Amino acid sequence: AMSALPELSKKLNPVLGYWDPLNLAELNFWGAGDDATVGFLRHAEIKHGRVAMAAFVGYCVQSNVHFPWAPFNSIPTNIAPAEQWAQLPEAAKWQIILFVGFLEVYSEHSFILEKYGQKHYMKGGKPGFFPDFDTMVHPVPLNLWDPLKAYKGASAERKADGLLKEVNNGRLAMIGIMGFCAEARVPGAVPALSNIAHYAGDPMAPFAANFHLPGFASXXXXXX
Amino acid sequence: SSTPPEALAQIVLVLSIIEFNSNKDKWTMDTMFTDPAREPGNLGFDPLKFGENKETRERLAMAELKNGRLAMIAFSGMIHQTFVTGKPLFASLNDIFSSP
Amino acid sequence: SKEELATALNPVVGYFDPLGLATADFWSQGNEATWGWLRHAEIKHGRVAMFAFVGYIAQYNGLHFGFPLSLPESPSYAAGLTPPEQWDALPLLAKAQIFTFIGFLEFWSELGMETHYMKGGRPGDYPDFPKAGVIPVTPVKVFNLYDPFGFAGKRSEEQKAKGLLAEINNGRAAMIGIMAFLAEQKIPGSVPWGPHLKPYAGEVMAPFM
Amino acid sequence: VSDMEGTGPETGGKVFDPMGLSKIASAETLAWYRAAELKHSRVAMAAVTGWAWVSSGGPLFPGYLSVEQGVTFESLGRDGYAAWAAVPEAGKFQILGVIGILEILSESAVKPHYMAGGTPGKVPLLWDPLGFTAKLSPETLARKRLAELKNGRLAMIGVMSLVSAHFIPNSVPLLPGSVXXXXXXXXX
Amino acid sequence: SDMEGTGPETGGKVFDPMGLSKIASAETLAWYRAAELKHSRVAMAAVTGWAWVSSGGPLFPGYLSVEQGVTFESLGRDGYAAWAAVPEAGKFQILGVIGILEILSESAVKPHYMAGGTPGKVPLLWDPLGFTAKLSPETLARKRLAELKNGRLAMIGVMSLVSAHFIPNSVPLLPGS
Ligand code: CLA
Numbered sequence: 001a002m003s004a005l006p007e008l009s010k011k012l013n014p015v016l017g018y019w020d021p022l023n024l025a026e027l028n029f030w031g032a033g034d035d036a037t038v039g040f041l042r043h044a045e046i047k048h049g050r051v052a053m054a055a056f057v058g059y060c061v062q063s064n065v066h067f068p069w070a071p072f073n074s075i076p077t078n079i080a081p082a083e084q085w086a087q088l089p090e091a092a093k094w095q096i097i098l099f100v101g102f103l104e105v106y107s108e109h110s111f112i113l114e115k116y117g118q119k120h121y122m123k124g125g126k127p128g129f130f131p132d133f134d135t136m137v138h139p140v141p142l143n144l145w146d147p148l149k150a151y152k153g154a155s156a157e158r159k160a161d162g163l164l165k166e167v168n169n170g171r172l173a174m175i176g177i178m179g180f181c182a183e184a185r186v187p188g189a190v191p192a193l194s195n196i197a198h199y200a201g202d203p204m205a206p207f208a209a210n211f212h213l214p215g216f217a218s219x220x221x222x223x224x
Numbered sequence: 225s226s227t228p229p230e231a232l233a234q235i236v237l238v239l240s241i242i243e244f245n246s247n248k249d250k251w252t253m254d255t256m257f258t259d260p261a262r263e264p265g266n267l268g269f270d271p272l273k274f275g276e277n278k279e280t281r282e283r284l285a286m287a288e289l290k291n292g293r294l295a296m297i298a299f300s301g302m303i304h305q306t307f308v309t310g311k312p313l314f315a316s317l318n319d320i321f322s323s324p
Numbered sequence: 325s326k327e328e329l330a331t332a333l334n335p336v337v338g339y340f341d342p343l344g345l346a347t348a349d350f351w352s353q354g355n356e357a358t359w360g361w362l363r364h365a366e367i368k369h370g371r372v373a374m375f376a377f378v379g380y381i382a383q384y385n386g387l388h389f390g391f392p393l394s395l396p397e398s399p400s401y402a403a404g405l406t407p408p409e410q411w412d413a414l415p416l417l418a419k420a421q422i423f424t425f426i427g428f429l430e431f432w433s434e435l436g437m438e439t440h441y442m443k444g445g446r447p448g449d450y451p452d453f454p455k456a457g458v459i460p461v462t463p464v465k466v467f468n469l470y471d472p473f474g475f476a477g478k479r480s481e482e483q484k485a486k487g488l489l490a491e492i493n494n495g496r497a498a499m500i501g502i503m504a505f506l507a508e509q510k511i512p513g514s515v516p517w518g519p520h521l522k523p524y525a526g527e528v529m530a531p532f533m
Numbered sequence: 534v535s536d537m538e539g540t541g542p543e544t545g546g547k548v549f550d551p552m553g554l555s556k557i558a559s560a561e562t563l564a565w566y567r568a569a570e571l572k573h574s575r576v577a578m579a580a581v582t583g584w585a586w587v588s589s590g591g592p593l594f595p596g597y598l599s600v601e602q603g604v605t606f607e608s609l610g611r612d613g614y615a616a617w618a619a620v621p622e623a624g625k626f627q628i629l630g631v632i633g634i635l636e637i638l639s640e641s642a643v644k645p646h647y648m649a650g651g652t653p654g655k656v657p658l659l660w661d662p663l664g665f666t667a668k669l670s671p672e673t674l675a676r677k678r679l680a681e682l683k684n685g686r687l688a689m690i691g692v693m694s695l696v697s698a699h700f701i702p703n704s705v706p707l708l709p710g711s712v713x714x715x716x717x718x719x720x721x
Numbered sequence: 722s723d724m725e726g727t728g729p730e731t732g733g734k735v736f737d738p739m740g741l742s743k744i745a746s747a748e749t750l751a752w753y754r755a756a757e758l759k760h761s762r763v764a765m766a767a768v769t770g771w772a773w774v775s776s777g778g779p780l781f782p783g784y785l786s787v788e789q790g791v792t793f794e795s796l797g798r799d800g801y802a803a804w805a806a807v808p809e810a811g812k813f814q815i816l817g818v819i820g821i822l823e824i825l826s827e828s829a830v831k832p833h834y835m836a837g838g839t840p841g842k843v844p845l846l847w848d849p850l851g852f853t854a855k856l857s858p859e860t861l862a863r864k865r866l867a868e869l870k871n872g873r874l875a876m877i878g879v880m881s882l883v884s885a886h887f888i889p890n891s892v893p894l895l896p897g898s
Pocket residue numbers: 535536537538539540541544547548549550553554555563566567569570573686687689690693
């Protein structure tokens with residue numbers, strides 16, 4: 001709804017609620033009405049926040065250490081960890097991207113979302129409603145959210161407080177990972193940090209150099 | 225005179241066939257307008273059916289008549305200009321508006 | 325049409341035609357003939373790919389057959405290595421004979437059916453072989469294609485429907501598998517995450533090379 | 534006035550009649566105009582596609598073409614429009630015969646003629662064999678018809694540009710272009 | 722008359738020292754506002770381009786007519802030496818596209834701005850993405866006022882740049898080249 005955003009923004013920050021000067025929250029930028037727009041923006045923000053909390057934690061984790069399983073040291077000990085990701089195997093990156101995309105398909109599937117107990121986020125459902133893994137053919141034990149429970153029938157107030165904390169913590173994490181990527185790319189960008197270094201190539205470029213693929217991997221004539 | 229004469233023979237033959245069949249027995253002055261429904265110039269050639277409007281029929285008839293008279297005068301001028309110049313029309317026109 | 329798609333697969337398919345080939349016309353025959361033809365073509369393609377995928381793996385692992393087929397020659401079950409080149413190794417007569425056999429099989433498939441699938445029959449329903457009213461053959465030819473020995477007649481109606489849905493889905497899987505195998509065979513780099521094959525053959529969609 | 538179809542969001546909800554060219558005629562002449570416009574649109578769409586498939590890419594049909602004169606599809610490997618005057622001599626006639634049969638059947642076997650209360654542009658079967666104009670809503674069909682009209686007008690302007698590009702000096706202010714005869718070599 | 726544009730910095734009144742109203746009808750006021758808005762938008766584009774090209778800016782990566790050999794960097798960081806560096810084909814194509822767009826603008830707005838309508842508004846070429854599709858009518862008036870103010874500042878800016886190029890040491894903050 002239009003009026004739920006001011007009250008939630010007051011809840012997460014009482015000093016500056018309903019900050020938005022961008023004039024997009026009214027735009028039906030799919031021609032699907034105001035409510036679908038608000039759901040899409042909320043889902044996109046929450047998704048960006050979660051991906052960036054994971055990215056910031058991964059950067060802080062593998063920026064100094066690694067995990068020895070089988071030859072997982074030659075990749076990690078090569079420049080910054082972004083260059084380590086760029087130097088990873090092509091099948092590895094393809095498997096990662098396709099597994100994430102399969103999770104996207106499971107999230108966006110209306111039948112899978114309806115079994116968990118709500119609808120699509122553009123159709124009145126709560127933006128961010130990754131459904132349970134109960135639908136396939138051969139049993140999968142681990143879910144994505146609550147894989148080993150670590151949660152119970154908590155209060156709805158506790159759920160709302162956790163959602164608000166997740167939203168603003170994800171915003172601060174997106175700022176942090178953007179600053180870290182900018183400092184890795186352009187030295188002297190973030191003036192409060194001068195320790196993270198080394199190039200990332202193009203950080204917004206998964207496939208580079210090592211991955212051959214069927215054409216169209218022309219990194220030549222790139223931009224800045 | 226430059227083009228083959230068989231081309232002219234076939235063109236004149238096709239025109240002869242067209243106007244022999246367009247009025248099967250309606251040649252001469254005393255036989256053409258015997259029916260009091262043949263208005264002059266109406267050979268029935270209106271495939272697109274412009275003449276079923278009946279509001280622009282008069283303006284189209286006047287446009288055809290005035291354009292025909294203008295084309296008569298124009299073609300006479302073009303022919304005699306080529307006769308007095310020995311050159312085509314627009315080359316002669318460029319030589320009129322040359323410089324001095 | 326929605327019921328078969330939903331019972332086959334609910335999450336990634338509600339109806340899922342980016343190309344609107346269902347509810348088309350197909351030779352000005354109607355929607356029902358279109359639907360029956362499309363379903364029969366799907367079932368036939370899935371069955372052919374299922375048999376051919378089993379044949380491809382049983383030829384790639386090295387399992388040939390005994391006895392000297394075409395005994396005067398040696399274009400037999402020791403000739404080729406890749407299964408496309410194995411099928412290309414049949415000189416002239418083996419391919420023509422199996423083509424005539426399949427031609428008869430599909431001719432009777434479309435002949436003996438009591439009601440055609442484009443006219444209101446069940447797609448994928450192979451009709452039974454007839455009595456001794458066809459040519460010089462004395463008995464019923466035992467082979468058929470569905471239930472040669474009366475074993476499959478014990479299944480119930482719900483079991484038959486579940487088997488039909490499993491047949492359709494396994495058909496699609498085998499179709500994808502054979503095209504993946506041939507793409508790996510012809511184009512290296514194409515189809516990663518599969519078994520590694522060698523680059524050979526040319527125009528595998530062309531019989532008489 | 535026409536007031537039927539083809540006024541998109543470029544002139545804006547209104548008919549484009551500077552000279553008019555309508556209201557000087559009857560109701561059937563407007564339907565003839567629409568039939569001519571749609572045929573021109575489809576022909577120029579196919580002509581743009583053929584010019585693209587001949588001028589640069591050249592994905593020639595595999596095999597020979599004439600069998601008697603030895604004309605090969607690879608031998609037609611120069612010019613957009615001089616390639617037309619190399620397709621044997623009976624090869625042109627067997628294309629013009631197909632086109633003539635299609636149009637005599639389009640004008641005869643369509644029971645209401647378009648100049649008598651019918652619709653300009655219909656189908657015996659040759660349009661949509663695969664059912665690509667299937668169960669889609671009539672608003673979607675109207676949108677696709679408008680897209681066809683605008684794409685065809687753009688295609689007519691496109692073929693008009695690619696014909697008279699290397700023959701009228703600059704004209705089109707672009708740098709590339711192909712050199713051939715403007716019009717084709719008088720049918721057969 | 723009343724119109725838009727009037728706000729602060731003038732006391733809420735129409736700024737018009739030397740006549741130039743009371744000889745203008747509704748059509749003339751409509752033409753005045755349409756010319757003002759077109760000048761404002763052209764001048765905003767002009768300052769945004771001049772500042773980005775001359776000061777800094779990464780410039781467009783590419784070649785700009787591979788056949789002739791002119792490169793994007795070789796136009797320069799001036800404009801009157803870079804507009805002249807643009808080839809005649811590019812000049813012709815720019816002018817023809819703008820002329821086609823404005824003929825469509827004149828013939829496509831269903832009430833013309835001097836025959837009714839709203840001056841300075843063309844449904845063509847404006848917002849394709851719906852950024853101003855359903856703003857409130859009071860917010861749209863404020864943004865129209867902001868467009869007018871930023872536009873007038875932009876026209877002053879463009880003529881400052883042109884005056885500094887033609888007449889050196891005019892516009893004193895702006896350098897001599
Ligand atoms: C020969 C092709 C052709 C034909 C038959 C039509 C026919 C029609 N158009 Mg149309 N159109 C065409 C080409 C054509 N168009 C092209 C190329 C464009 C893009 C510029 C348009 C853009 C267009 C718009 C935007 C609209 C129409 C509309 C109409 C309809 C009403 C107009 C009318 O009654 O007069 C049509 C009568 C004729 C065309 C007589 C022929 C006169 C000849 C062509 C003059 C020659 C001009 C000259 C050589 C062209 C120079 C080159 C050019 C590239 C500039 C009518 C069915 C209107 C409509 O649909 O109303 C509902 C409408 O709003 N057309």
